[model samples]
Target: YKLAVQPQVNKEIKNNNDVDIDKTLVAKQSVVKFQLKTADLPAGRAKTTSFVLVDPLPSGYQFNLEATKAASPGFDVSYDKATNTVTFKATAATLATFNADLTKSVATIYPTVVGQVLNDGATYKNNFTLTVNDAYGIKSNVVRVTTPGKPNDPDNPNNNYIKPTKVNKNENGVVIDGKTVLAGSTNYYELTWDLDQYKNDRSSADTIQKGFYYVDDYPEEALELRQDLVKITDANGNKVTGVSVDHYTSLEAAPQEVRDVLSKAGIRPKGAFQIFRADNPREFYDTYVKNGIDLKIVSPMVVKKQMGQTGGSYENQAYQIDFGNGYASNIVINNVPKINPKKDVTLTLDPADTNNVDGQTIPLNTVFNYRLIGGIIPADHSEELFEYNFYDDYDQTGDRYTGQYKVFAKVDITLKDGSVIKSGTDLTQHTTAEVDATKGALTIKFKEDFLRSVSIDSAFQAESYIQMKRIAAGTFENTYVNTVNKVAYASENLYFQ
Candidate 1:
């Protein structure tokens, strides 16, 4: 769903402006009234002489020429459909008031029901859903964690692994390949066993029959097979009135141009279809292979990234391949799990040393203090807990704790004037000045936990302070981060210099 920027031009101002502004999109047939913030004006030198500003009426939108009467009566305004522009002319008074703080501008626009492409929820769009992983490394023992022997050979440390000429799926136990992949071309949370356990025995007295079958009860929730749609080969007849269903395929034997569009499913055809007769899967696969098709194709599966869906491990890979009535095959099952995860906090950097700005100053070799103040307010989520992290850097990325803050602390309770909060001791606390290298981190966490005894917002205020000084060769900056939840906040670097 996230569209990486390819870009033509972002919206002017809000889309290409100096500051963050809001652009309103009317819902359906509703109308919206908004103002022209200073940003609405072209970016460049302003004019002393009165001028008319031109704003284009977006396609699919309509505006009345007299909307200015109800919008900004004093200004000269007109909408010209021929030019597809809205013109706003100003008097001396209006021109004088123009500034970065933008004094005024207004409008109301209505969608025309038709015209340009629609931004309606449905249609040529919605959200779209790749990953390829090759974790090249050696296996482990002592400090081993998850998935060992991956891309490795514990039995033969000096040996390497190469794709087998045929099925070789039983070699892994501790090793697993995990990748949050998409089909743009991007789990291998799997097990491999090429059982020498099937036969083509078709005897009237035999219990098993001749054919192939697999009991792959993929959890209905984790993943669902994805069906792609391609144009029906012929768009003009009963033979081709709709889109073709997609399924998994291996090698391509279709015409050159036809093969060009099937890359997404890895096969010339797609997955959701049983292109050949099945109860006798032997004949189905035989016919395919003989026709120069490859049956070792992977069915494209869809995993919905929904909220709260437990991931990492898998459910019963509970499936079986019965060799019909003559060949023996029974229910089989096994499973394991895996996980993969993969920050802006704003800051008010006040060199509280000199300007009587408590602990905000910069004088070489001088120990100065600064107040690292920021809040986790309602604008922030996880209304459960107020969480934030504080890391301080002084004169040098080196240590300077030299007994300046013996009272090293963290407080969550507070003072007056809502702008200030407190921090205290808890399961999460780290206030250091006596450091090592030039950098360090302090982590803060709260379950966003249920109610505490505070009975107020105090429990939701993330505030912490650290003592730092002017050391040698220092940018003297600090960072406030919430590594656990709401990873982004107002500020990050508080350069106190």
Candidate 2:
């Protein structure tokens, strides 16, 4: 904090007559005892009289006593009635010191002077050293002297001075600012989708369709579904058959304010995806998407500046593909297709009609599942064999099994619509895939989109760590039905803890 300056007034000097020579003449060989006092002394005028006294005047005829070591005592002293007491003149051997206790109210002399004056206005010159022991003692670069001016001469044009003044009580306290002034505010972009009409027939093998479905109404239980064929054509405009189609489903629920902001920006809400690991082939995927999923909504909300890759798989594959190399293909993605749901999509309680209730807010509980052919392969056989090691030891030597496997991952969100407003690729691949042979499981971590770029306070970062731990632990414990076509499988009930 910067220090503020205040007005001060002089309190040492009494009156002009007290400084007059004719009133009190300097006696010859007078011993002046100048006791050291507080350190806060006013700066002497360039040509004014400043006073200091000594115990005994030096034994010398017509000799002046100058403070030699004036650190505590200060420079040599020269006395002139017009200048009050003796003035420390010339350079001193010692440095000055400081005393916080000393204020403007205290009147104390430093560097006592011994020798007496011969007579008033009579020239008497002598030099002696004085010690300085105050904070400003080091700052005593120049010495000053006071002398009577010639008749009609202007009041010592060279005399520079300062006077102490009283301080105001009201302005004594300090004030501190708490608000942070950032260079700029951050902007968020989003995408949304709506899918309410699409329903999964539990009895049919193709329970799901490729077209969009309401995320909030997505089934919580396990169900197999096929992608609805919206189009079928060949390069020559010929009809094609046997095209495998699948729609991903998951759950994600965002705050009303967040949805409103995105909706205003034209981003529709959509359900999340259900991802299942081949090693843990269960009915449900391992993770569920809630509010703040990494899906893109179609909106112009200003996004935060990111430094690295935006979205990618743990293997560093871009979420969205570019029309280059041999990967140029398009897929019709479907999610919740409506912004407003006529029925309550709540899972924990009865649906409320009022928007004030949590149920009234958009429900993000949607199932997201996607099917791709080449996402999985056979696991290495030579790798170390292991068993369930989560709590206690089980078996390891014979636990090793190898065959073709499948990989799945998904994100679900419960917003108002199903239109992606802003979408980008994950630039940084911080999250990695890990296999726990002891538990017969493979886990992939979720990486936050803005973790690296955003500047977070220490406390906030700690909180984020706790939340991450909970999510990871949850995913590890919810394991069920871990098998895929009898070749590879594990519990599917497992998810983010």
Candidate 3:
């Protein structure tokens, strides 16, 4: 049997814009859509037509079995993690279509497989072999996947070289203007290093004999680290693998090694991550910085503190990189982001009609539409649990109550840019509404714990709309009130003729 692999060329790019292009550098996590085609297979046997093909995966790759099965239908596939190989087996029914002329079944058996590369910045070589019927072992040509090794513009200091730069970014990796982010939003702190510049700044060292460490300080009151979102990257913006990043919620909970590292840094951060490879320092250097590869750390942060009515700022401790040498570089630039909190809960009646004697008159038996909206305000400071309750009383003399109404209650943790950090909480179980025709009153109540549990950056709102009919020539009045923590924060009175 003769076998071959298609799309012989592959490289990992920054944005994964295109895969058909040929290049020497590749990015980590890039998927290789590999295809396998076979020819010159023996004729289908009268007894059994079983065929077997084994594709040994290259180092730094993991089998994407689901995608592979979808790409090669009608073939039984399995992956052996120990040997790092993918096996494809075809049964007798599948091989029955093959004939002596090799033209009866499209002249070739084509199958596909997928593999995702990991953080080994070296070239990966892959190949496969197949056997069918009486045909013996047959090997296919090798394909390669290479990670981007060197800086694209290493010579230009202005373009490629940069100091330990730190900046504030949103979830989409876009820089925040004026370094301000809304409370309760997902933001990021990025630290970048140009290897050439970093090397020149410190004592010249080629290979790292001891592993380096990255220590950051996230103040408990203002910011918190999201463990899963913390990632390290090379110059190509590809994720670097095999490096251990340890995150701690509290300094007291850290081990002696971690506590020792923090003690030397002279910082007691509430939340932080440490990057190091104590098992093998040389391997870490070879994979991360040996080939002029720049380095970057993107740490996702959740703004914990809520800015009050006026506004406030969130600060960060200096980010430091310990080269494991006597020298440690501190990228000390405070990223103080101005934070704005949600306003206090508010109530408003629609139609813009003032509550005065001259309020617009309504014709007899005419239908009128009225809607009341209330704003959900985040708490300024930690306080006791408060009841979120709203009430509306209508003088049903001149206007007839139709018993037609709608109520909506919702809460969300969102940012100023309209990007939702967390939203659409199921508040149904925590809220209740009722309309009492006898008392000419409408009430909407939320559990006391809701407001108390709401974070400083979250927004809460509740609203109701009702239809009324004019019964006689007289004045109509409405009184709406909202109470929180046993205090009436918002109240309004309206009169209509």
Candidate 4:
């Protein structure tokens, strides 16, 4: 007697023929059948006989005997998942067919099983084998259902996903990525990112496999994500409330898996901290690998097209998925925002007394007028308070400041509009600075609310003029000599320290 196992593409029972081959498949969706043929040598009116067939399901498929509904008069067909086997029995029948569904039939990837097939970004194909015995001991050939197309990939150009993920190229500061007006006093804007890909909804895959945990990280270039600031959301764009976040100080201090990732990335832990923003723990996939390095330059400047300046752009990283077996799919954007670039505060001297050979000479006990101009005033005042320092020293050594700023002969001012006017009716109203003789220096201080006072929508400028008496002359005398004289002003933002 001889036995044969033929794979069939058609669901309708067909004559088990000899020459034609069957080929049918779907990534994780197809259902195929196995057919058995046998012709005995003893004769046509065969006597009592027994037969059994053991069908072994492949990784991406399951025996669907209950749904197989494959029946023949006097023949018995049944399946047992306990041993992943299907049995065929009959007293005289020599024909049979068994059907199985693609692995997609499972609930979710959770309770993960090794060697599973999927409709993920990548495709899968598996082979099914069947064993047949003559009630004696004989085996059938191994059959395979090769995969056709791949899993449905969601990462695309519209979502900013890469064909193969890569890290940020440039680092920038002062990017105003996006924001809202204050519900409070100051206009606090926000920068954002997702290193763990929580940004993508992977519920379709439904299972978290090994190598499925990721480190949510950030760097010294930006502020903490303030556990409270990480707003979670469902697929419908609704808020996912009540999720608790763990506190952290550095990327080096998160879970070991988290640390190993960034440490290997070597973005440097100095003056930086890693940020964790968790929503779904299941969809998380560790980007690390079995063959090469898995690294990203996940700085806050991740989206640093300079949104804080001219503005930045969002980045989508397309990545592979590692099932402890393979890889698949893609995540956005921060920066070291800078503004009010470097500038010079200026001071000018106008010789009024013989302090002018060129009206530039001052004889014994002469007086002169000094004018000081501030550096450019920036719009938004969101930069830093790079203290503007004014220096006015002369006379002896670094000794006593030679001139005494006794009074404002007449102080003048320039408005944000560039118009000029006398400061106040009295020097008293405007205020005058003097030399701290003991310290060999002169000083001035503005109220803490100084910058906010103007509070206008325009970038501004200003100038100050003061009267000074040459109470003492330098050893160079009434001849010619240089002096240390300067003025300063700054731009500031409350968000910075």
For candidate 4, the lDDT comes to 0.32
> Distance (Å) between predicted and true CA of 348, model 1?
16
Report the alpha-carbon TM-score of model 3 versus the true structure.
Answer: 0.37
Residues 1-497 of candidate 2: C-alpha lDDT, one tens digit per residue: 11111112111211112232221212222222222222433433121122322222222323234422333244554554443334454232322222222232223434433323322122222232222322112212121122211122132332111111111001112110111111111111111221110111111112111111111111222112222212323223344232222234422365453344234323342353222111221121111111111122211111111210121111000111100001111121111101110111122211111333341222132221111111111121111111111111112222221212222111121112332212122212433334566575443332343222222211011000000111111112222221111112222111122
Q: In candidate 3, what are the lDDT values of residues 1-497, reduced to their tens digit? A: 33321112221221123243122333344565556666533343232255677888877877789978977776889999998989888755566555334422234455677766664234567667776554555777666645432234232222232235566665555665344343455557776544432322111122233345666555555666776887788888798776676766677877987677567645566554443333465555555544556677777776553432224565543344333322233432223222211111112223233434453567787877455555445423222234666677778887666766544544444433445433333344666777788888877677666555654344555545556777889776667665544444434333312
Q: What is the lDDT of candidate 3?
A: 0.53
Candidate 2 residue spans exceeding 4 A from truth: 1-432, 447-450, 454-497
User: How many residue pairs collide in each prediction?
Assistant: 55, 148, 4, 31
Q: Write the per-residue lDDT of candidate 4 for residues 1-497, one digit (tens) a residue.
A: 23322222111111112112132222222233445433322222222234454455454555565444443333466666776655556434232212121211211100001122333222222222222334334554444433322223233211222133323221123432232111111212222222222222221223332222223334323333334334433333455332234435665556775455344433333433433322343323322121112233222222222223332223222222232212222333422222221211112332132221232444555544344333334333333222222334333431233343322222343335555445332222333455566654454322223323333323433333444455655532211111111112233221232
Candidate 1 vs 4: which has more TM-score: 4
Q: Model 4 — TM-score against the truth?
A: 0.37
Q: For residues 1-497, what per-residue lDDT tens digits would candidate 1 score against the true structure?
A: 12111111112211111222122211122222223422233323333234334455444434544443455544566567785665555545654544333323322121111112122211110010000011111211111011011133332232221111111112122221221221111022221211111111111111122233322234444445433421111111123221122222332533343233223212322222222113444453333312222123122333434311233332323121222211111222222211111111112233222333244345566654444443332221112222234344333463264433322123454322344334433323232333444444333233333223232334234333344445665445554432213333334333333
Query: Candidate 1: where are CA atoms >4 Å away?
Result: 1-361, 379-383, 391-399, 402-459, 473-477, 484-497
Greater-lDDT candidate between 3 and 4: 3
Best by lDDT: 3
User: Relative to the unseen true structure, what is the C-alpha lDDT of residue 453 in candidate 2, on a scale of 0 to 100?
Assistant: 24
Candidate that beats the other on TM-score, 2 or 3, i.e. the better one = 3
lDDT of each: 0.29, 0.22, 0.53, 0.32
**Residue 350, candidate 3: how far off, in angstroms?**
9.0
